[PDB]
Amino acid sequence: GYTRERTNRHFFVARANAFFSRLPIARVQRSLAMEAVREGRMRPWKYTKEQILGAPVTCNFEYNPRPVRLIGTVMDAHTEETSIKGGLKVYARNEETNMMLWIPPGNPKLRHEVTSTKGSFQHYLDERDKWDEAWITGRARMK
Amino acid sequence: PSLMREKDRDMYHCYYPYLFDHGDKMSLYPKIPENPREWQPEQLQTTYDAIREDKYDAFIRLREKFPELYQDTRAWDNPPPFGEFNMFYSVRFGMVGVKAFTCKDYDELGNQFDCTAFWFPDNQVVKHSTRNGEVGTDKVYVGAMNVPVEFHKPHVAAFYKAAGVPVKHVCAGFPITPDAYAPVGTKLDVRHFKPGQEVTITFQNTDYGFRGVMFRHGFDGGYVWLGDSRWQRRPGAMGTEGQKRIYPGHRMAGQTGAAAETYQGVPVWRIDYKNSLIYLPTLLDADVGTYVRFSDTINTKGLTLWNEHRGLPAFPTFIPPEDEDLSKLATDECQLKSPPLYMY
Amino acid sequence: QFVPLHLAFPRRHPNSWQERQFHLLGYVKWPKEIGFYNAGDNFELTPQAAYRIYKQNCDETFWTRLHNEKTIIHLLPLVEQDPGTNMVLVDDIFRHHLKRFGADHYIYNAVMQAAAFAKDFPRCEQLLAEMRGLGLEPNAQSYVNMMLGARLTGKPRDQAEAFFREGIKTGAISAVMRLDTEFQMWMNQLERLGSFKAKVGYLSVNEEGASPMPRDMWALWGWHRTEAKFISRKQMISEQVQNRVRSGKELVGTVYQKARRQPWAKYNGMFPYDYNGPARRPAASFVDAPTPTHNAEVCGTAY
Amino acid sequence: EQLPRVAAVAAQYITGQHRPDFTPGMITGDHVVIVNIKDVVMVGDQWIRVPITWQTAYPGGKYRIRLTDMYERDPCMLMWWFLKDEVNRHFVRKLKTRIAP
Amino acid sequence: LRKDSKWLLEERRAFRQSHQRAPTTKEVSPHVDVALAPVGALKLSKYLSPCSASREVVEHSLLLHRTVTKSKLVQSSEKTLFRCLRCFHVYAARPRTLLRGEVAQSWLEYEAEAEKEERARQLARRPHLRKKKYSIGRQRASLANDPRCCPLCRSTKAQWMMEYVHHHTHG
Amino acid sequence: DATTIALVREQPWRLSASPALFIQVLQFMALIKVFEPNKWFTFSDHAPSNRADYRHAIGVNHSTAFWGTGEELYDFMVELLRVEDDGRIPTMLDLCTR
Amino acid sequence: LSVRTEDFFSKEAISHARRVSWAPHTTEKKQGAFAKLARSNFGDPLPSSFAQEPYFEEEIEAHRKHHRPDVYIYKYNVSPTHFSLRE
Amino acid sequence: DSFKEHYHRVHLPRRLALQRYARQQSLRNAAKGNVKAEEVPYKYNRWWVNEEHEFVHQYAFVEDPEVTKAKRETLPPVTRENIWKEPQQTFFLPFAPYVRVVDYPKDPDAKFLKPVNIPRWKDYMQRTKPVIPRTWY
Amino acid sequence: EGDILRYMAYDARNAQFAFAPIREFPNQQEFFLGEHDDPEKLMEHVDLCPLLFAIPHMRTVVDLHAEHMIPTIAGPGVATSLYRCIYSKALLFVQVHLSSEVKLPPQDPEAFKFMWKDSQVLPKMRIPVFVRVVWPTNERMSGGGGLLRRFNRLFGTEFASDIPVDAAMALLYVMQWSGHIKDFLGVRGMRQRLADLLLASQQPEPTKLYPGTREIPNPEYTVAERLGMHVQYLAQLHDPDISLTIQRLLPVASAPVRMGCAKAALIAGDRELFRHIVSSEPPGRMQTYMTKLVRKR
Amino acid sequence: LKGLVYPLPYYAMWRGNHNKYTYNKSTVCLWGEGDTRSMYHQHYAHAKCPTDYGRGGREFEYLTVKRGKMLQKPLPRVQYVAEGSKPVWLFKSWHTPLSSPSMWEREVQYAEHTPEHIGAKRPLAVVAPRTMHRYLFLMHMEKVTITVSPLLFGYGHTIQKAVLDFYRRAISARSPFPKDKVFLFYAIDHITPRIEVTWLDGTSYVPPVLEGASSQDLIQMVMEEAWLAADRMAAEGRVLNPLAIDDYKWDQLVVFKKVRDKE
RNA sequence: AUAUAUUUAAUUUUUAUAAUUAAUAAUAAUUAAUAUAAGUACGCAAGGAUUGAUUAUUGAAAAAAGAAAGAAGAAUAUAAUUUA
Numbered sequence A: 001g002y003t004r005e006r007t008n009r010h011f012f013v014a015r016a017n018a019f020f021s022r023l024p025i026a027r028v029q030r031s032l033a034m035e036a037v038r039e040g041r042m043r044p045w046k047y048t049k050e051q052i053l054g055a056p057v058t059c060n061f062e063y064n065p066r067p068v069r070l071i072g073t074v075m076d077a078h079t080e081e082t083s084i085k086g087g088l089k090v091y092a093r094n095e096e097t098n099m100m101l102w103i104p105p106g107n108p109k110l111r112h113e114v115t116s117t118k119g120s121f122q123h124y125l126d127e128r129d130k131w132d133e134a135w136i137t138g139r140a141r142m143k
Numbered sequence B: 001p002s003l004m005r006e007k008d009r010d011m012y013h014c015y016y017p018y019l020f021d022h023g024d025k026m027s028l029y030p031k032i033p034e035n036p037r038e039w040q041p042e043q044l045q046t047t048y049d050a051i052r053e054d055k056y057d058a059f060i061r062l063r064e065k066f067p068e069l070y071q072d073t074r075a076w077d078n079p080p081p082f083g084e085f086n087m088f089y090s091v092r093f094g095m096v097g098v099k100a101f102t103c104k105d106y107d108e109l110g111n112q113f114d115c116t117a118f119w120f121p122d123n124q125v126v127k128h129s130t131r132n133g134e135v136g137t138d139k140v141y142v143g144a145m146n147v148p149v150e151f152h153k154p155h156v157a158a159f160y161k162a163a164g165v166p167v168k169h170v171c172a173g174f175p176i177t178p179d180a181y182a183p184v185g186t187k188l189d190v191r192h193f194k195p196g197q198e199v200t201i202t203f204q205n206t207d208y209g210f211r212g213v214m215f216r217h218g219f220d221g222g223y224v225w226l227g228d229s230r231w232q233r234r235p236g237a238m239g240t241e242g243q244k245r246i247y248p249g250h251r252m253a254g255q256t257g258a259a260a261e262t263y264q265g266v267p268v269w270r271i272d273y274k275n276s277l278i279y280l281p282t283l284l285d286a287d288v289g290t291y292v293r294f295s296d297t298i299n300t301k302g303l304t305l306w307n308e309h310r311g312l313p314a315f316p317t318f319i320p321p322e323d324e325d326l327s328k329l330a331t332d333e334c335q336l337k338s339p340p341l342y343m344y
Numbered sequence C: 001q002f003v004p005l006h007l008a009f010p011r012r013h014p015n016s017w018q019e020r021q022f023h024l025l026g027y028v029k030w031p032k033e034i035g036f037y038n039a040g041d042n043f044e045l046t047p048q049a050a051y052r053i054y055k056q057n058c059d060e061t062f063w064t065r066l067h068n069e070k071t072i073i074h075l076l077p078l079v080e081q082d083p084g085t086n087m088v089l090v091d092d093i094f095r096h097h098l099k100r101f102g103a104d105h106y107i108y109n110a111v112m113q114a115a116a117f118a119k120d121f122p123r124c125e126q127l128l129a130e131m132r133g134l135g136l137e138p139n140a141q142s143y144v145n146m147m148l149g150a151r152l153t154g155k156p157r158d159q160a161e162a163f164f165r166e167g168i169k170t171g172a173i174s175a176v177m178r179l180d181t182e183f184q185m186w187m188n189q190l191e192r193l194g195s196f197k198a199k200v201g202y203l204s205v206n207e208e209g210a211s212p213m214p215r216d217m218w219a220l221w222g223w224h225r226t227e228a229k230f231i232s233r234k235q236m237i238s239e240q241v242q243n244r245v246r247s248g249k250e251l252v253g254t255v256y257q258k259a260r261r262q263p264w265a266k267y268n269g270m271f272p273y274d275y276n277g278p279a280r281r282p283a284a285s286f287v288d289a290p291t292p293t294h295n296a297e298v299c300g301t302a303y
Numbered sequence D: 001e002q003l004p005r006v007a008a009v010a011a012q013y014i015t016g017q018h019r020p021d022f023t024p025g026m027i028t029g030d031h032v033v034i035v036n037i038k039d040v041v042m043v044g045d046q047w048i049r050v051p052i053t054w055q056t057a058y059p060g061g062k063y064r065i066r067l068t069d070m071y072e073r074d075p076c077m078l079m080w081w082f083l084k085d086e087v088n089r090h091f092v093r094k095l096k097t098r099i100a101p
Numbered sequence E: 001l002r003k004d005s006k007w008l009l010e011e012r013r014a015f016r017q018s019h020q021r022a023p024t025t026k027e028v029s030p031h032v033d034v035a036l037a038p039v040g041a042l043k044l045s046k047y048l049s050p051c052s053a054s055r056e057v058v059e060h061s062l063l064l065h066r067t068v069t070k071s072k073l074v075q076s077s078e079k080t081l082f083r084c085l086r087c088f089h090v091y092a093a094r095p096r097t098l099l100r101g102e103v104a105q106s107w108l109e110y111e112a113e114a115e116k117e118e119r120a121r122q123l124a125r126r127p128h129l130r131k132k133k134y135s136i137g138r139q140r141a142s143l144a145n146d147p148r149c150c151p152l153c154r155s156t157k158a159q160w161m162m163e164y165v166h167h168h169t170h171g
Numbered sequence F: 001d002a003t004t005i006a007l008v009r010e011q012p013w014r015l016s017a018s019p020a021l022f023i024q025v026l027q028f029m030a031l032i033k034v035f036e037p038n039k040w041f042t043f044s045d046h047a048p049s050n051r052a053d054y055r056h057a058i059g060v061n062h063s064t065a066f067w068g069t070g071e072e073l074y075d076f077m078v079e080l081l082r083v084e085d086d087g088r089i090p091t092m093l094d095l096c097t098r
Numbered sequence G: 001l002s003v004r005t006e007d008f009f010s011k012e013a014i015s016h017a018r019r020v021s022w023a024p025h026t027t028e029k030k031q032g033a034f035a036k037l038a039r040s041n042f043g044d045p046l047p048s049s050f051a052q053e054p055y056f057e058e059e060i061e062a063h064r065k066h067h068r069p070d071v072y073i074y075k076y077n078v079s080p081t082h083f084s085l086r087e
Numbered sequence H: 001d002s003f004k005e006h007y008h009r010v011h012l013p014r015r016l017a018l019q020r021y022a023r024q025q026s027l028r029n030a031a032k033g034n035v036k037a038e039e040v041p042y043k044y045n046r047w048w049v050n051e052e053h054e055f056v057h058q059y060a061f062v063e064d065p066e067v068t069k070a071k072r073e074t075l076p077p078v079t080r081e082n083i084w085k086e087p088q089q090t091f092f093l094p095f096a097p098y099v100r101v102v103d104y105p106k107d108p109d110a111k112f113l114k115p116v117n118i119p120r121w122k123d124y125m126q127r128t129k130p131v132i133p134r135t136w137y
Numbered sequence I: 001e002g003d004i005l006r007y008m009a010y011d012a013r014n015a016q017f018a019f020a021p022i023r024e025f026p027n028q029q030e031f032f033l034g035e036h037d038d039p040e041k042l043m044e045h046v047d048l049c050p051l052l053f054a055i056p057h058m059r060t061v062v063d064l065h066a067e068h069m070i071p072t073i074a075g076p077g078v079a080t081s082l083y084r085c086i087y088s089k090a091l092l093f094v095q096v097h098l099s100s101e102v103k104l105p106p107q108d109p110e111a112f113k114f115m116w117k118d119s120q121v122l123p124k125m126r127i128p129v130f131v132r133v134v135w136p137t138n139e140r141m142s143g144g145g146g147l148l149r150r151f152n153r154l155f156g157t158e159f160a161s162d163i164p165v166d167a168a169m170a171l172l173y174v175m176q177w178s179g180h181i182k183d184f185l186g187v188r189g190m191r192q193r194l195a196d197l198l199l200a201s202q203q204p205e206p207t208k209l210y211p212g213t214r215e216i217p218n219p220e221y222t223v224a225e226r227l228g229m230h231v232q233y234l235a236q237l238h239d240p241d242i243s244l245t246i247q248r249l250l251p252v253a254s255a256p257v258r259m260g261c262a263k264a265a266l267i268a269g270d271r272e273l274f275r276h277i278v279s280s281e282p283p284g285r286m287q288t289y290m291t292k293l294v295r296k297r
Numbered sequence J: 001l002k003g004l005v006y007p008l009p010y011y012a013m014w015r016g017n018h019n020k021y022t023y024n025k026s027t028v029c030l031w032g033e034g035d036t037r038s039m040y041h042q043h044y045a046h047a048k049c050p051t052d053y054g055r056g057g058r059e060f061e062y063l064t065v066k067r068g069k070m071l072q073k074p075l076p077r078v079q080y081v082a083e084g085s086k087p088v089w090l091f092k093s094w095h096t097p098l099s100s101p102s103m104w105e106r107e108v109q110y111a112e113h114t115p116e117h118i119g120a121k122r123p124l125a126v127v128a129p130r131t132m133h134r135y136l137f138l139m140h141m142e143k144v145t146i147t148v149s150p151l152l153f154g155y156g157h158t159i160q161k162a163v164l165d166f167y168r169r170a171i172s173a174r175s176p177f178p179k180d181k182v183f184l185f186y187a188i189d190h191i192t193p194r195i196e197v198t199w200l201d202g203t204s205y206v207p208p209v210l211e212g213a214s215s216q217d218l219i220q221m222v223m224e225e226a227w228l229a230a231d232r233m234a235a236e237g238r239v240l241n242p243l244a245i246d247d248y249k250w251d252q253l254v255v256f257k258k259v260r261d262k263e
Numbered sequence K: 001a002u003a004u005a006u007u008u009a010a011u012u013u014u015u016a017u018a019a020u021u022a023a024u025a026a027u028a029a030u031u032a033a034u035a036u037a038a039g040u041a042c043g044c045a046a047g048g049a050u051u052g053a054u055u056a057u058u059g060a061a062a063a064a065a066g067a068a069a070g071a072a073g074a075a076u077a078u079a080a081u082u083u084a
């Protein structure tokens, strides 16, 4: 017969964006990141996007019986400093198999280490062109 | 559960010695009518029955002699006194939190959980209210987010004055049992909740305004039809009913969001009792700053939440020890993580 | 399962159907001076009416020793209240009993209990000695009358123990426990009984229903609705003839019959009279009754 | 006393029909207090066979309950329903004349 | 592959009306028995030159088994790896709701029309029931639970990753 | 409500001890019309209000309907006045004046 | 909480009126003794339901149920253990 | 206004008046100078065996006004350290775990050598509720 | 304190098996405390011993009426309990075996129920009780082998030289209190008992209440059943050449004896002799049951 | 379930899914439930307390909450017991066969419950075994003398037939040699056929024979009295030959096989 | 392939505070398959048990009292980030 979709209840409509100031939320983020660092799920990093972009990386995904290892080229780093957000874009090619992964830091069953903070933009461009050509070939063979 | 007719409550179905009321003192025989004329012609007034006497005597002897063998049979008498936490009767009031932010965590098995952190600024038991003093009709109002006096409206500042509790921004009522009371003005520490605890949360999702019938119901809104009219299954005769009006509940375009949404049975992830934060692995729809309300889940899968196998709650409410100082205690020291769980 | 086949509540008969069925069964509303339905809805005959029907039917061919016993039984409370005048009626009953049937355990035990209530322990002893001399050995009822007379007159515990031990020796009373506990049980029973004047015993309770017609005519005494407390006279005569023709099957109660008695499989359907009310039948008119000369006076209690 | 008979007897005093100065416009009457409704009696098979039905605003919402169901829910509901019927027998046009009694 | 909860009860129901007997746990087959392509066949068409006349007769044999594998896959509802071919993203999806539009089965069409009526019956009885059940928080959660399209390219075209990795590592 | 809790539940003897307070609280509870809370919400006598005696389960008049304001206090006072019939001697009526 | 052998092994639920004794030696099933003597396990399910309307009349001692004397007082049968109405 | 709606709208004040009349009998006691809380008879007959020979337990709980006032006024005691520190278990352990392996029997495949104290598969599957005597988990 | 200690002794029964320390000490020796109908009486005797702690590590009450503990031809299991000595701290592992019997169940149990329904007398059952004493290497705790050998030559039994005198005296006290000191014996006495049972089987046997049949067997134990049970008891006692003994007595054995021989081989742990027995026995219900005993493919 | 919801699972599932209409107190109900406490019923008047009647039908209460202080009434006290009298204990177990009288014997037995006039050292049994006695068992019975009158039978067709068939069943009863214990006596001038039974102790019992009493009825009476007498002997200290499998039991399993093959 | 009436979807703008009353049995007929249940009764053999818990959808269900012509942002998501 009849129903109501909105509620003007005071407890529901009231907000706390004005009082969010007394909560050290950024300090909580940093504390979570530091707890992860001290536990060992991640390792602190301080690099910029253009510096890390194009640097080889090795990632081991722990798995009984054999942990799977993968050597790729860092294509994009989402964060310049360590945080709970993180994010890395790696590109690795096996024998006739290309793949583009988004590795999040802090996973205990995942240990990724960049072999050098320095990167070569030339090799980055080479890997980017290879990946784009593979993607275009796949799409053309599909359609 | 198991069906049990009231007519099956005779002494031939009782598991323990059936005790008749018999005025002030319980007896093992039905109350003999004081007026002898009331004796029905076939009613056999029993004063002493050796069968029942021997059975009851042996039962009492064994109960008093072997307490370890007959420990479970002790609930027949000396029941648990009122005031102690009960597994099937004691429900405690929840709290009022503020959705602080979102992050992602990982368990030791390797599962990723996109969690949201709620913040409980100042939880204080504000009021008690029962309607006309009936059973189970009493509830406790808890207030949150202490504010100055120039903030609230006059008619609500007047209530906070009348109560004497420091004026809070919001106030939510939780219906509880009388043995779970807490004096007015009691501070509620976040450790009132446990990390391995299922919680039911209620909030207000975000507002999208007037949205199309496609965006409201997704693919469901495009096709809406319902016919309760009679239709001939076999060509034998002719007869049907015309669907004159549109049946109530027809899915159309209208207000979207800005409603009271309730999630039932989400487990807690971690608790920080220095900044009063709770983490839940479920992504909510509400905005940042929506005053959510947390309450305890009654039971799931036919199993009560609070039991000896899982753990005992902080009944009625968690009170910290005296020598504990959250100022001296660091942030990393105030972290309680739930035991691992896999959901795939 | 949840849909009930039978229903005990709410009731299925209004008030008028009570009167209709009462007049249908064949019962007659007798005045209070004759008898009435007590608190337990049982029909109770006034001692005066009992003595009247005794005086009127003591000569007929259907009178019996058991009828004389029941007459003395009905006179018992009046004898307890006034042992001076009612003992004359009891003695008249005993005289007629000796004229017609003679010496009998029934009449002797009845007069022994009458003397016990009338507080005549010498008379109780004389009656027991007369039984022993005539050759009627004292029965368990006689020894219990001895004990009751002792307790009522005020004879001591050892005086009553003498009679109890004599009964045990004779064998009329079978005991399954120690003699002390058996005597304690019998004394507790007699104490709960009490007398019509001792304010502790059940007999002290003189409250009565005082209703010419029972309140609920469909009251059950057993398990099913077919075992009604009030039945028609044809069925009652059937029960009476069965009680004598099949008196053997009453001795044993076997689990077969016990589980057969369960009415869980008996039919419970609404007969045409369950819709049309009990069949209307005329009541016994009393136009031939003389006009009440003391209609303004109030009738007193039975005893 | 049976339900319809007691309902008619109650309504005749509720609506004020027993008064010689009864006027259809002026709704006056006597306050009847009905007692022991839990012990009201209807003849056999009626508590099971007599239906009480109504319609709700939702489609196919034809509720049909037995007298036994309405009695186990609330015994006063049966007496109120029969009083409503006995009243609407004569006053159904005006909401006042059909509700006020 | 364990069958769907609602679909399993649909086979138990149709079996009681057909055989007039209680369903047998060995006949209803609550676990879908999906068959992979033979290891020899993938390497058969690989080393076979395109000019080989025997390649068409074995290619047609694989295309038929490639569709049969789809027919057995749609009967499951457990989480399974499904990659899209448009943007080539790998995600976990349920085969029944994802491959519903490609399989083109009338009984899968009639159950979809049956469940839409079943939802309308509950929503028409109580209008407010839609408020809690169908909300933006609930609608977005159910779409992530049944990813009928890729969250990156929003394409309904998908492929069984298990069959794909079986075809790659052998070819 | 606070006066009721103070004079009924926790201190049930103050009224019987002091008859002046009894009459004073009675006259105050008569001056403020407590037994007809509809006159609290009515604004014109030609259209009386039902804010207190009416309530519907949809959610209307929840906090304002059926207020047990002075019912318990009035019951305690009438019970104190009926205590005389069971006590055979008037305590309150002997303490108070004509 | 830690495991429990009482929770491991179930127990029969028999009403107190039908129990022969509250001893732990008899708190088990009655068919168990016969199965132990016969050296074979029995799994007979749903042996008997009570009734759709279970009724049992009052039962008295073994000696009393056959050696009840005909001791009567004013209108009530009076036994050392029971009272009843007489006519 | 539906039939049930009108019935309840006209009867709810009458229900409240009836409850007030009921509590007036309780207030009669405190009026005479003897404040006595209401007493309820404790029922010892709450453990039954149903028709199908299984255990049923009725739950009867009473409320004490003095204990209610005490919990209203006095603050609760200090929460237990272990109670607030030890987290609650997530998964509910079964009533009888099936270990399938015992080190006592020399030949593990010997079905007759396994000790009896280890619960069986039938108990592992059927024992989902507490035993007849013990009511709580 | 008393109630707490008593409930600790009670929870000693609720304790599980895996976490109970069984193979804690190196040296171990088994003894046969006799055959009893109700082993709970002997268990109570063992519990009420001054030389043992009142709080065991693992207790298991034996109830021959529970469906999971009914002695079947296919053994339901072996009840295990554990006790700790007070002064020597030695372990006592009491085993109540139920797989010793070799009787086959009746074909029609209803006839057997009708036969033994109204019987006011029930035949005794022969249920064995074994005790494994476990102790570590002790040089002076046992008091030298001379004292133990003197005790052996005095009491006719045999004990280890390094066995604790406390455990030995506790066992002797329990046996003399229960009165089964004559039935109590080790492997040396079990061999003599087996020879005596062989002589009895060679001798003619008296008639029982009624001859056992495939439809109605006789719950009274026969000489052949006793022989098979004692062969199983010797195998449990771990006689060194029990395999050779079974291989020698196989041809002269009946079917009730061969069933016990198969169970004894299964207890010993060799598969070749068990397969030989199960292949040499003619097809029958006994053969089907002995195949049902062990898990197969 | 709106309002206060208790942690008890499924406590209102039989009433539906709503906590509504709890104020009610009179519901539809069968015998033994609801407001039938005013009405009288033979079984329930002794099997239920008039205050124990609750809600009937689906409204059966699995969780009841009330206000007010709980008044725990004291347990009943055992009567007819001497203060300071130490009772003997009887350990019952399934190892003892159920047919033995020691199982039905009292467990908690004082000295004040022991009959001294009979001459027993223990109190007698309380509950008797329930069995449709179809045959006699003359093991605990010394002898039986059935005196019957063969003069005229048109006066006792039922009684004479009953007594004669009872004598026939007593001859065919379960005994090693019942012909040595059963005796029949023709009385040319007798009032009514009598059956005297003498046990091993020598007690004389007379089963009354009335019209409508069947031979099976007489057998059941005699066997019940025989069990009582055997209990008396065992209490006095006399030893009795226990019941076991006999050739009569085999002859009975014959017809058992016959009926089990029939149906 | 015409703007209508009934009927529906909403809204009437912080209301400190849900629902003892309309949703009159049930959101599935209080489920429920599943590894482990069992290389096991039943079957000469071949083969083949009843069965209910952790893996799932199982919480079934309506938030109606306060002063109103800005953008409900002083707008670049801070309740003023210093401010002449």
Ligand SMILES: [Mg+2]
Pocket: K013
């Ligand atoms: Mg507003």
Ligand SMILES: [Zn+2]
Pocket: E084, E085, E086, E087, E088, E089, E150, E151, E152, E153, E154, E155
């Ligand atoms: Zn994609």
